[PDB]
UniProtKB/TrEMBL annotation:
Involved in peptide bond synthesis. Stimulates efficient translation and peptide-bond synthesis on native or reconstituted 70S ribosomes in vitro. Probably functions indirectly by altering the affinity of the ribosome for aminoacyl-tRNA, thus increasing their reactivity as acceptors for peptidyl transferase. It comes from Staphylococcus aureus. Residues 129-184 form the Elongation factor P C-terminal domain. One of its GO terms (biological process) is peptide biosynthetic process. Its main location: cytoplasm. GO terms for cellular component: cytosol. Keywords: Cytoplasm, Elongation factor, Initiation factor, Protein biosynthesis. One of its GO terms (molecular function) is translation initiation factor activity. Pathway: Protein biosynthesis; polypeptide chain elongation. This is Elongation factor P. It is found in: Cytoplasm. The gene is efp. CDD domains: S1_EF-P_repeat_1, S1_EF-P_repeat_2. Belongs to the elongation factor P family. It holds the Pfam family EFP_N.
Length: 185
């Protein structure tokens, strides 16, 4: 287990029935006779920013985060099949996760599924995904406004705002994670 003198700018600890990621720890000695550690740590499951004060003399359980890059297979949209490329472990993701993965994904593409003890805690899509734009209307009206965008549809079925000079068939690069539009190839 982890002692209160062992923390880093990134360290995963399982406490409060959650898995946390210490962003910045403060080993504080208030002069009470016991030292504490005010740790700024992010709930790795929800993405929430919290802080926890650890107490000297009470060790905590460490959390090892398991990253699995899986090839994107397909099934009915309640569960999608992902092939563990680490070694042949078929893992199916549930509708809730599929909702986000259905926003950005490519079939046959490797995504990084983040598990803890086999339990899916998150799914990481590649930071730059390439999606073909299907059904969009060009016609940039002479102006060169950078915010001249229209509601376009990509192959995934996701609707995103493309510049008015984007034509059907163009492969749009998107920064998955933030949703920032990158320019068509």
């Amino acid at each position: 287990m982890i002692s209160v003198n062992d923390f880093k700018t990134g360290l995963t600890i399982s406490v409060d029935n959650a898995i946390w990621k210490v962003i910045d720890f403060q080993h504080v000695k208030p002069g009470k006779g016991s030292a504490f550690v005010r740790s700024k740590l992010r709930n790795l499951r929800t993405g929430a920013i919290q802080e926890k004060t650890f107490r000297a003399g009470e060790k905590v359980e460490p959390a090892m985060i398991e990253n699995r890059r899986m090839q994107y297979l397909y099934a009915d949209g309640d569960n999608h099949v992902f092939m563990d490329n680490e070694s042949f472990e078929q893992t199916e993701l549930s509708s809730d996760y599929l909702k986000e993965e259905l926003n950005y994904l490519k079939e046959g593409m490797e995504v990084q599924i983040q598990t803890y003890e086999g339990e899916t805690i998150g799914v990481e899509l590649p930071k730059t995904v390439e999606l073909t734009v299907t059904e969009t209307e060009p016609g940039i009206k002479g102006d060169t406004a950078t915010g001249a965008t229209k509601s376009a549809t990509v192959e995934t079925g996701y609707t995103l705002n493309v510049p008015l000079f984007v034509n059907e068939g163009d492969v749009l690069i998107i920064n998955t994670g933030d949703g920032s539009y990158i320019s068509r190839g």
